Amino acid sequence: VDWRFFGRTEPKEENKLWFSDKITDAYNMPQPTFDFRFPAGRTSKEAEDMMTDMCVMSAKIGGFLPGSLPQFMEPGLVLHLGGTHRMGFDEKEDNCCVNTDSRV
Amino acid sequence: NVIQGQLMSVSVPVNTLVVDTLSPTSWQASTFFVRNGSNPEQDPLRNLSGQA
Amino acid sequence: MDIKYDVVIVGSGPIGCTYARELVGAGYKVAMFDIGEIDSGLKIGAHKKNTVEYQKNIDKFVNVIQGQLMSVSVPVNTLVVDTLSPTSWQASTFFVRNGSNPEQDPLRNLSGQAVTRVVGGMSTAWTCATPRFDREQRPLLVKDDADADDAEWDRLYTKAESYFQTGTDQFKESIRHNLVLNKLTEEYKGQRDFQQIPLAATRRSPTFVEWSSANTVFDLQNRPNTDAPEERFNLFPAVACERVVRNALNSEIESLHIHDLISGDRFEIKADVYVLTAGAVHNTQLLVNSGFGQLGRPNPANPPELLPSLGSYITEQSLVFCQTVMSTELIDSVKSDMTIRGTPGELTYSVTYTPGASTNKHPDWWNEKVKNHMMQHQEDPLPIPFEDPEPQVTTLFQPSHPWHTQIHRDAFSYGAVQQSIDSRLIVDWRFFGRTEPKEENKLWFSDKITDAYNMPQPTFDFRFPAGRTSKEAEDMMTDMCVMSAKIGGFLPGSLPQFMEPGLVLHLGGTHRMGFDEKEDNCCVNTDSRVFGFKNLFLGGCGNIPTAYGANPTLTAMSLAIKSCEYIKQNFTPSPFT
Amino acid sequence: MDIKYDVVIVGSGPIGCTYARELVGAGYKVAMFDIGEIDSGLKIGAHKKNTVEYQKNIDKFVNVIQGQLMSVSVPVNTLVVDTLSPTSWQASTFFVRNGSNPEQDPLRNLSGQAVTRVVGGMSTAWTCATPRFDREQRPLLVKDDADADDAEWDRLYTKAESYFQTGTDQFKESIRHNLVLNKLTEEYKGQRDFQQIPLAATRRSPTFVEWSSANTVFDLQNRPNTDAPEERFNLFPAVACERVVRNALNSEIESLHIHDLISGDRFEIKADVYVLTAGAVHNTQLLVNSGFGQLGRPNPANPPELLPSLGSYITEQSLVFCQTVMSTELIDSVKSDMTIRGTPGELTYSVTYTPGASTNKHPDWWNEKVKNHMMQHQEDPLPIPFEDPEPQVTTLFQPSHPWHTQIHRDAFSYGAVQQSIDSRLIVDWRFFGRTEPKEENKLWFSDKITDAYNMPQPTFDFRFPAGRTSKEAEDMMTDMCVMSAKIGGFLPGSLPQFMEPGLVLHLGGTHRMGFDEKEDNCCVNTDSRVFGFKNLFLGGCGNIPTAYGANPTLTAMSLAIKSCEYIKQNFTPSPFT
Ligand SMILES: Cc1cc2nc3c(=O)[nH]c(=O)nc-3n(C[C@H](O)[C@H](O)[C@H](O)COP(=O)(O)OP(=O)(O)OC[C@H]3O[C@@H](n4cnc5c(N)ncnc54)[C@H](O)[C@@H]3O)c2cc1C
Ligand SMILES: Cc1cc2nc3c(=O)[nH]c(=O)nc-3n(C[C@H](O)[C@H](O)[C@H](O)COP(=O)(O)OP(=O)(O)OC[C@H]3O[C@@H](n4cnc5c(N)ncnc54)[C@H](O)[C@@H]3O)c2cc1C
Ligand SMILES: OC[C@H]1O[C@@H](O)[C@H](F)[C@@H](O)[C@@H]1O
Ligand SMILES: OC[C@H]1O[C@@H](O)[C@H](F)[C@@H](O)[C@@H]1O
Ligand SMILES: OC[C@H]1O[C@@H](O)[C@H](F)[C@@H](O)[C@@H]1O
């Protein structure tokens, strides 16, 4: 049986996806560049509590399969990226790019 | 394999792995230069390396 | 080499040395044979980790361990190599090669079980953890009287602790030790107690710990000598002991048959008292080779005439392991009492504290080390001193957490990627389970295959017993996962895992103790005397008949001390001539 | 411990032991210091492979080797670990961690270089191959007189060979050795000669070889003693020699500064004659720490006052490696002479040979071994006896194949899948290239970073020179692929490959010899005396100034012998009062 637990990550202004003004990608578009770390505080404590939860809960079904021991996956492997063009009610107050009808 | 075959990494930092068992005749780098589509903007310690 | 001694001891490990210390000290004329050789420097049988080089390069010591551990039973290899050149010679079958044991069922093995053959035995490389067993783990020495059983154990353990130089204070001022200790104390307040692992060791300076060994128990120097002019002892390395010779009545041992490995000659040695301390595996091998028990695949249709419990009820502990990288919170806590002003490398960088202030979370000795490290190494991003010793923390076995624990650092071979992580961050976690003795779990010896010393090949038939053993092993894994997350997350490459069976090397019960041979299914009595034989004694973890999770050597030494009390009351040392 | 000797020697490896053997024997009062400790049993500085246990479990010896090899220069680690828990403390930069050397360019390293600190030095673990250099590889000891040069090198090598007990006969009756040696002799008939590797070793029994070491050269016991009542010698282990003190005129050494690692005491030792034999790396370190050469990153705009060539022109050999799995054709050839009646295991099975017949491809000693093996082990599918010794074959360096070669078995750690292949089938191949001395190839010492003993941290700036060295190294790889294929295909897991630079441990040239300091860009003369200094000598492969492929230790020892002749002719022993 596979176990995958997914943690939520607090939106922080310093976590960014930006694009190079020199380097380009395979389609000649500005090369994407991340500046990301899991925020300290809640996101991090909950990630490690989630790991422990997986360890505890999985043991009710059976022990770990050698070669697939409990581990955090490489950042972004999960492909659940959000917030890159985020929604809110007020551009300034809610630090956002689109409104609730998703219009820029 | 199908999944892997279509997931193209978003940002791969410059590679700094040392290969020091090339034959003496092979051409060899004096620096870790921008090679193989890697992104020199990317700090390898602040990446989403698994993003594709 | 004389032909006749008062006492012969097979094996120069810490248990053989306990018998030596006690019997040499009482005036007996003693010889000790070891199949292995002197190679620990001028201190014979001493701990190999005590060189200045290994105390400066502690991770290299893993190689010393691996270099002297030889696998007990390796099943026939069935790995397929199908990329040989067409010209190379290729097998049509998986035949017996490379010393593999075709008796061995690969799914019922202790594949990690291994033995050492060097003077000092495994004590030249061991980790030195010597906890006492509580009652739950401990064999009875006195029946129907728990207070007297308690008192007898206390007396024997106290003496064994003096022989090993056990203490709990050699790491008392390590920052990392106290950081983990204090955190776990707080997290489990009112639920579990934490302390230093009792270690057989003496600190000689801030960067040097003299680890104890066989040598600490008995220095293994031939006697008489200048410091012991009245004592008699001879050590004979590179002598494989092969058989103790039974009289026809099975009531006495008549001699010991040896094979001098250097001359290649075989001889007999006579003694009044024969003590076997060759370890849990080779004691059993020697006995089986001498006609005790049953040679060959065990067969209930044909139960052995002598010691039918020999090589049955064997126990080996389950062991789970991981490493962690210290949490940001804990690391930050290390410098919580500091006032930090300016920036590193600049003239105005200032790290100070107030010695003695009530609000300080740490003692002055800790703060001063932290201040000095941060001021003298402004380029380093960690507040822990470079030379800060290892943590050595434990919460001892209890009914609500029936496993032994070690939260510590021992020598380790880190992969290149792991070496990317500063070692000051890394903590090892090892939790040890107890294993119920079960008649079906067996160490037996082949009647056909022999080992590298031409002796019957050891073969295991082992699985962790269903029921309590298995349940607690899995619960133990969970507990390690929960407890370790309080200190930091897992180090990639050292994720929580069970270790290969027997890698832990805490094998017991192979020649087990009890009050009554039949009723307690055992091979020796509480004096360690083999049932029916006046003059044959067994020492070592093989005597231990219980399910235990704590490290067993200190308990085995305690039984050896008790055995020696019996010997001293029942045999007379020859006159000194 | 006096503080006045006739001769002090730094280092107890085989080269220091050569100075000791010569000078103790000639009547000088000798002290030797070694930063490491005694750890080969009662024979001080003896080969650690000479225990019965290692010769029964030879592949375990790899751990002994690894356990005492400490990497000289490890660059800062930039491996990314991005699967830590979010709670774990994490670096923003690849900071200087874990004893790494921030001076070290990771792309201009000898990452494989290592040192050993034990009494006996690397000779407690070495492979014992001692070939002579031919002229093309050898430094000149006599100018403009080829025959006189040859005679001098003959006399020195013959003496060195006696000290090491070098022989070419210890494997003469191995079936595997002869199988490979005869095949390669045939294949290269008229083209190359093959022979046994010259080995410093004496066979004691069909299953035991006593490998030579420092102890062979000089037993390292304190003198006077019963067997040497007129000799004077003291060995002091665990003493870090740190500097030799120059007089103001730079014409004489005045003392040796030491640091006793056990007491912590720091003294000055006085002698008539100072000999440095701490190895190619640590001789250079000691010299640089004493004010010779230049400390810190090479700056050719500030050339050093003393020994400007010190630490330049370093040479390390290219090493290529594979293993092979013996061909079907060769294995079948082993039993070429046998008549095989019937079926293995079945009742009438016979393997027989006619002794001394003339169609027989093999000698009677071979056929008899093969016969008894096939008859006694009918379940085994190979004709080679189980206890048959390793192959030990070489074709020595020549202009047309200017590499040293060893086609043999030394201790190896086989992967699980490799252990699937029967070891009787496996042969190691190691071919060793010669490297041109080039001024830009350097060993230098940091003026800021220090090693584990608080000495200036060694840093390499090395690449294999373009031109002949690189072309030959690649030619050499091809040659190994071509020749190995005559014996069998590559063992998966041990495919042809260049080893990490410096792993070979044949570093030379660090304090190189020549006739004239300036013209020959060297540090010592042919008496191994440091230019300008009356009483300081260096010994070791650091003296060798040439490009050589063969293993260098016998050549270094020959140079040390010559050096001692100068000493005997120039310094008078103290009266033994
Ligand atoms: C890496 C490691 C770490 C360990 N850590 C701990 C720990 O922290 N705490 C703990 O309690 N225990 C630990 N141990 C286990 C502990 O070392 C053993 O329990 C202890 O050494 C047993 O002592 P012994 O005298 O019975 O047997 P050994 O130490 O095994 O000695 C047996 C001796 O008999 C000799 N011998 C074998 N066959 C023959 C023969 N036929 N003829 C003559 N002589 C023979 C052997 O050479 C050996 O010297 C560790 C072991 C290892 C290797
Ligand atoms: C596994 C291996 C296999 C090898 N096989 C071969 C082979 O087959 N043939 C061959 O020719 N060579 C071989 N060698 C290389 C050979 O062992 C060395 O060439 C030889 O040992 C060098 O001799 P030495 O006396 O100059 O230096 P070493 O043997 O290096 O001894 C130098 C000594 O100085 C001591 N020392 C270091 N620093 C200090 C200090 N500051 N103060 C006091 N003492 C110090 C060290 O402890 C050491 O004992 C092998 C080496 C290795 C390790
Ligand atoms: O590998 C990460 C993925 O694995 C699956 O189990 C999920 F359903 C996904 O949401 C996710 O993209
Ligand atoms: O590798 C298993 C070993 O590891 C240590 O940490 C222990 F203290 C031992 O008692 C044990 O034998
Ligand atoms: O691993 C490198 C070593 O391997 C052996 O085969 C050699 F004989 C040595 O000269 C050498 O130092």
Side-chain angles (χ1 to χ4, degrees), chain D residues 185-200:
Chain D
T185 291
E186 189 182 276
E187 294 281 352
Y188 285 87
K189 243 225 179 176
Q191 291 172 313
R192 312 182 179 185
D193 297 321
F194 286 84
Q195 56 167 83
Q196 200 206 270
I197 297 161
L199 287 172

Short mmCIF file of all heavy atoms in Angstrom, two decimals, chain D residues 185-200:
data_model
loop_
_atom_site.label_atom_id
_atom_site.label_comp_id
_atom_site.label_asym_id
_atom_site.label_seq_id
_atom_site.Cartn_x
_atom_site.Cartn_y
_atom_site.Cartn_z
N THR D 185 52.23 -15.59 -21.39
CA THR D 185 53.54 -15.91 -22.00
C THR D 185 53.38 -16.35 -23.45
O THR D 185 54.00 -15.77 -24.34
CB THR D 185 54.24 -17.01 -21.20
OG1 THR D 185 54.63 -16.44 -19.94
CG2 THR D 185 55.63 -17.50 -21.87
N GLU D 186 52.49 -17.32 -23.70
CA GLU D 186 52.16 -17.77 -25.08
C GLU D 186 51.67 -16.61 -25.96
O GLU D 186 52.21 -16.35 -27.07
CB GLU D 186 51.13 -18.93 -25.01
CG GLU D 186 50.83 -19.68 -26.33
CD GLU D 186 49.76 -20.79 -26.18
OE1 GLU D 186 50.13 -21.93 -25.77
OE2 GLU D 186 48.53 -20.53 -26.48
N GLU D 187 50.65 -15.88 -25.50
CA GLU D 187 50.07 -14.82 -26.35
C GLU D 187 51.06 -13.76 -26.76
O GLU D 187 50.91 -13.13 -27.86
CB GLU D 187 48.87 -14.11 -25.67
CG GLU D 187 47.63 -14.98 -25.43
CD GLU D 187 46.77 -15.16 -26.69
OE1 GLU D 187 47.02 -14.51 -27.72
OE2 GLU D 187 45.83 -15.98 -26.64
N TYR D 188 52.04 -13.48 -25.89
CA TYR D 188 52.94 -12.37 -26.19
C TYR D 188 54.35 -12.90 -26.53
O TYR D 188 55.32 -12.16 -26.41
CB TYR D 188 53.02 -11.43 -25.01
CG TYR D 188 51.79 -10.57 -24.85
CD1 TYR D 188 50.70 -11.04 -24.13
CD2 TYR D 188 51.72 -9.34 -25.46
CE1 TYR D 188 49.51 -10.22 -24.01
CE2 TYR D 188 50.55 -8.52 -25.35
CZ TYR D 188 49.47 -9.00 -24.60
OH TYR D 188 48.35 -8.23 -24.47
N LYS D 189 54.41 -14.17 -26.94
CA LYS D 189 55.67 -14.88 -27.25
C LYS D 189 56.46 -14.02 -28.17
O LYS D 189 55.93 -13.59 -29.18
CB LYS D 189 55.35 -16.17 -28.04
CG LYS D 189 55.74 -17.40 -27.31
CD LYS D 189 56.46 -18.42 -28.23
CE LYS D 189 56.88 -19.66 -27.42
NZ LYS D 189 57.53 -20.79 -28.20
N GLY D 190 57.73 -13.77 -27.85
CA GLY D 190 58.55 -12.93 -28.71
C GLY D 190 58.30 -11.44 -28.59
O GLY D 190 58.90 -10.63 -29.34
N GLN D 191 57.40 -11.04 -27.68
CA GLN D 191 56.98 -9.66 -27.68
C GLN D 191 57.12 -9.01 -26.30
O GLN D 191 57.61 -7.87 -26.22
CB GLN D 191 55.52 -9.48 -28.16
CG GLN D 191 55.24 -9.77 -29.66
CD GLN D 191 53.75 -9.74 -29.97
OE1 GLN D 191 52.91 -10.34 -29.25
NE2 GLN D 191 53.39 -9.05 -31.05
N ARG D 192 56.66 -9.69 -25.27
CA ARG D 192 56.78 -9.23 -23.89
C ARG D 192 57.09 -10.41 -23.02
O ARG D 192 56.66 -11.53 -23.29
CB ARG D 192 55.48 -8.54 -23.38
CG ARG D 192 54.91 -7.51 -24.35
CD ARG D 192 53.66 -6.84 -23.74
NE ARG D 192 53.11 -5.83 -24.63
CZ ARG D 192 52.09 -5.05 -24.29
NH1 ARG D 192 51.58 -5.17 -23.08
NH2 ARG D 192 51.64 -4.11 -25.11
N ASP D 193 57.81 -10.16 -21.93
CA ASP D 193 58.05 -11.21 -20.97
C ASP D 193 57.13 -11.01 -19.76
O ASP D 193 56.93 -9.86 -19.32
CB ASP D 193 59.45 -11.19 -20.38
CG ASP D 193 60.54 -11.43 -21.42
OD1 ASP D 193 60.35 -12.26 -22.31
OD2 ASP D 193 61.62 -10.78 -21.37
N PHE D 194 56.70 -12.14 -19.21
CA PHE D 194 55.86 -12.18 -18.00
C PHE D 194 56.55 -12.99 -16.92
O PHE D 194 57.31 -13.89 -17.25
CB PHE D 194 54.48 -12.83 -18.33
CG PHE D 194 53.59 -11.95 -19.09
CD1 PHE D 194 53.70 -11.86 -20.46
CD2 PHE D 194 52.64 -11.15 -18.43
CE1 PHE D 194 52.88 -11.02 -21.21
CE2 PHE D 194 51.81 -10.27 -19.17
CZ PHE D 194 51.93 -10.22 -20.58
N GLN D 195 56.31 -12.67 -15.63
CA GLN D 195 56.96 -13.34 -14.54
C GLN D 195 56.05 -13.14 -13.32
O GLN D 195 55.03 -12.43 -13.42
CB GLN D 195 58.34 -12.69 -14.19
CG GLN D 195 58.27 -11.18 -13.88
CD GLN D 195 59.59 -10.71 -13.26
OE1 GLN D 195 60.54 -10.43 -14.00
NE2 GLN D 195 59.66 -10.70 -11.90
N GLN D 196 56.43 -13.74 -12.20
CA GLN D 196 55.79 -13.37 -10.94
C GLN D 196 56.11 -11.91 -10.51
O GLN D 196 57.24 -11.43 -10.65
CB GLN D 196 56.14 -14.40 -9.83
CG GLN D 196 55.10 -14.35 -8.64
CD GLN D 196 55.62 -14.79 -7.33
OE1 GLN D 196 55.53 -15.97 -7.00
NE2 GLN D 196 56.23 -13.83 -6.55
N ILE D 197 55.11 -11.15 -10.09
CA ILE D 197 55.38 -9.86 -9.40
C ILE D 197 56.44 -10.14 -8.33
O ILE D 197 56.29 -11.06 -7.55
CB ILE D 197 54.09 -9.34 -8.72
CG1 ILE D 197 53.04 -9.06 -9.80
CG2 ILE D 197 54.32 -8.07 -7.85
CD1 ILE D 197 51.56 -8.99 -9.22
N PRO D 198 57.49 -9.33 -8.26
CA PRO D 198 58.38 -9.43 -7.12
C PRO D 198 57.66 -8.94 -5.85
O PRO D 198 57.13 -7.81 -5.80
CB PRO D 198 59.50 -8.40 -7.47
CG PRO D 198 59.44 -8.34 -8.97
CD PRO D 198 57.94 -8.30 -9.23
N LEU D 199 57.63 -9.81 -4.87
CA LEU D 199 56.85 -9.58 -3.67
C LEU D 199 57.73 -9.64 -2.46
O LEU D 199 58.51 -10.56 -2.33
CB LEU D 199 55.75 -10.67 -3.54
CG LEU D 199 54.67 -10.36 -4.60
CD1 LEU D 199 53.64 -11.55 -4.64
CD2 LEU D 199 53.88 -9.08 -4.23
N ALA D 200 57.54 -8.68 -1.56
CA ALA D 200 58.24 -8.70 -0.25
C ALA D 200 57.44 -9.60 0.69
O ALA D 200 56.44 -9.17 1.31
CB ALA D 200 58.38 -7.28 0.29
#
